[PDB]
Amino acid sequence: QVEISMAEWDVMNIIWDKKSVSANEIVVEIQKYKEVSDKTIRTLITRLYKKEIIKRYKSENIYFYSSNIKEDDIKMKTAKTFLNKLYGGDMKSLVLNFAKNEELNNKEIEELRDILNDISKK
C-alpha cells in the first residue's frame, strides 16, 4: 500500500525540503519551476494529507505540512515499479535508452562509468 503519483511528487519534493511548509508556499514553489495551477496543487495536497503521507499542524490559524513518510523508502519502491514496467527491471536497458537518445553526454557517460568502477568489486 501507499503510492505517490508523479504529480504528487512535486508536492513531496517541497515538503521533504522543509521542516514544515504552508499550502501557499508549496503552490508558489511548484510554480517557480513548472506549470501546475493552485487548484490542482491543493487537490494534490489534500489527497496526500487524506492518505496520511503528509501530516499537518495549525499555527495562528495556518496549516503547516510535514512529511509523514520516509523519502528513501517510497522512492526505491516507486523506482523499482518504474524499472520493472518500462525496462523489464533492467538498469542497463534504462541507461542504454538514455545514451541512444543523446540524454547522456560524453562526460556524463564517463562520470557514470567512473562511479560504477568505484563501487565494483572487480
Q: What is the DSSP letter of 8?
A: H
Q: If binding is defined by CB under 8 A, does position 28 make contact with a copy of itself?
A: no
Residue whose CB is less far from a copy of itself, 58 or 85 = 85
> 120, 64, 113: which is closest to 55 by C-alpha?
64
The residues in 54-83 that bind a copy of itself, with binding defined as CB under 8 A, are: 72, 75-76, 78-82
Number of CB atoms found within 10 A of residue 36's CB: 15
2 binds a copy of itself (CB under 8 A): no
- Asked if 119 interacts with a copy of itself (CB under 8 A), we say yes
Instruction: Tell me the three cell numbers of residue 100.
Output: 541512444
**Interacting span for a copy of itself (CB under 8 A) from 17-25, 47-55, 62-70, 103-111:** 103-111
Among 46, 52, 62, 109, binds a copy of itself (CB under 8 A): 109
For the chain, the farthest-separated pair of C-alpha atoms sits apart, in whole angstroms, at: 59
Shortest CB 8 distance to a copy of itself, Å: 10
Helix axes 38-50, 6-17, angle to 10 degrees: 80
Q: Is residue 53 classed as helix, strand or coil in its secondary structure?
A: coil
| Cβ distance to a copy of itself smaller for residue 59 or 108 | 108
Q: Find the shortest distance in angstroms from Cβ 93 to a copy of itself.
A: 10
Cβ 56 vs Cβ 49: under 8 Å: yes
